[PDB]
Amino acid sequence: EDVRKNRLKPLATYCSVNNPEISFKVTNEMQCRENSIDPTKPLAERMKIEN
């Protein structure tokens, strides 16, 4: 359960509003959200599988 051992960590850090790669294009943020990694969410919540 360690945050550093979560296999979603590199994709979740990539899919962040703080990432220029995502920020610089309007569509990018939505492309992440549709792949179940929401950029506006905090890290641990961004990787959680709800319910």
Add this chain to the structure above:
Amino acid sequence: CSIIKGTGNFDKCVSQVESILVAPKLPLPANIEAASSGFESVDQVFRFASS
């Protein structure tokens, strides 16, 4: 829609120009080419690549 009627409200005109033309929530598509940067919105140009 049958008729378009003018209301001459400059501030509302500006807010609609912002919504439709300058800073749309989702811009019209523009595929990158050798001669272009890949931005699809004016809003994105000045927010991330101002000079």
